[PDB]
Swiss-Prot record, chains A, B:
Domain of life: Viruses
Domain Integrase catalytic: 1-143
Primary gene name: gag-pol
Record's protein name: Integrase
Primary role: Catalyzes viral DNA integration into the host chromosome, by performing a series of DNA cutting and joining reactions. This enzyme activity takes place after virion entry into a cell and reverse transcription of the RNA genome in dsDNA. The first step in the integration process is 3' processing. This step requires a complex comprising the viral genome, matrix protein, Vpr and integrase. This complex is called the pre-integration complex (PIC). The integrase protein removes 2 nucleotides from each 3' end of the viral DNA, leaving recessed CA OH's at the 3' ends.
Summary of subunit composition and partner proteins: Homotetramer; may further associate as a homohexadecamer. Part of the pre-integration complex (PIC) which is composed of viral genome, matrix protein, Vpr and integrase. Interacts with human SMARCB1/INI1 and human PSIP1/LEDGF isoform 1. Interacts with human KPNA3; this interaction might play a role in nuclear import of the pre-integration complex. Interacts with human NUP153; this interaction might play a role in nuclear import of the pre-integration complex.
Domains as described in the record: The core domain contains the D-x(n)-D-x(35)-E motif, named for the phylogenetically conserved glutamic acid and aspartic acid residues and the invariant 35 amino acid spacing between the second and third acidic residues. Each acidic residue of the D,D(35)E motif is independently essential for the 3'-processing and strand transfer activities of purified integrase protein.
Positions that bind Mg(2+) 3: 9, 61, 96
Record localization: Virion; Host nucleus; Host cytoplasm
Portion of the parent chain present: 1203 to 1354 of 1435
Length: 146, 146
């Protein structure tokens, strides 16, 4: 429910790494394909994310991915705190479910592009605008309510 | 004023290319440093932008940058129309002014990072949260008003 909360996790597909951020309260996704998991790439993703949306707290299923000096620098600069583990009723399985839907969609569109990263961005677009209201609409509502 | 309208322009700094998208009605920026101006890079930027915000129409000060097959494909897929030239009273000089502020800020923070792209993302963050209300707050309000 809390509106500044995002969960970041990486997945591998086709020998490449997909960084996925889910805005927990709405299910809205931002994702990028990165060459390999690196503190550098995560730091840079975080700086971009935080410049676009109000990021207060980051959750993850892999805490170690946020321990490098580059990533600490990013959270420090952007004023982001990282929760220890994951403390919640209403959001149970949301992030899991969103990551499950994103992958299903990537599968459906994969054939329409040469590059995995193109397919990822198509899937992100599809997911954010999907009317069950859309994640895209839900996140704006939450942030606007102020 | 119209809420689906973004202007995209490239600038060069340090022998590198900065792609800047300004949401005209609010002054909110998304920017990335790309290796060189290429249809490929623009197409990919557009696909990401449109997956995150409702992009109806793109304006530019360089129409030729939107003529490649890659970029046509992106606008076609995302349902984006491109205005011929630029038709407006209330937005006069906004995009010019926003690009002027972004560059001033890049200058102030450039020394705090090795990489230009890091400096760019710092400047984007600063610009979007700057309270005159912020661009970041204005864009959510506009999109939410529906
Ligand atoms: C190359 C680099 N190396 C670092 C080494 C140790 C600690 C931080 C950084 C950072 C870094 C990371 C950040 F997240 C960050 C800042 C720095 C210096 C300062 C402003 C706010 O956020 C960068 C950074 O490049 C990256 C590609 C890793 C972002 C740099 O360009 O200097
Ligand atoms: C490598 C590539 N080459 C192309 C050549 C001609 C026309 C389109 C593309 C596209 C493209 C561009 C798009 F914008 C796009 C689509 C394609 C195929 C299909 C879905 C919606 O948008 C890609 C694309 O890679 C880029 C890095 C340029 C995005 C690809 O991965 O195939």
């Amino acid at each position: 429910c809390s509106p500044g909360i995002w969960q970041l996790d990486c997945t591998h597909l086709e020998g490449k790494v997909i960084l996925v951020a889910v805005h927990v309260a709405s299910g809205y996704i931002e994702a990028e394909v990165i060459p390999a998991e690196t503190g550098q790439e995560t730091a840079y993703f975080l700086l971009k994310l935080a410049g676009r949306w109000p990021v207060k707290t980051v959750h993850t299923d892999n805490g170690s991915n946020f321990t490098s000096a580059t990533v600490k620098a990013a959270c420090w600069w952007a004023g982001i705190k990282q929760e220890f583990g994951i403390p919640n009723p209403q959001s149970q399985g949301v992030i899991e479910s969103m990551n499950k839907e994103l992958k299903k969609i990537i599968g459906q569109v994969r054939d329409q592009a040469e590059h995995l990263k193109t397919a990822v961005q198509m899937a992100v677009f599809i997911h954010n605008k999907k009317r069950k209201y859309s994640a895209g609409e839900r996140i704006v509502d939450i942030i606007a309510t102020d």
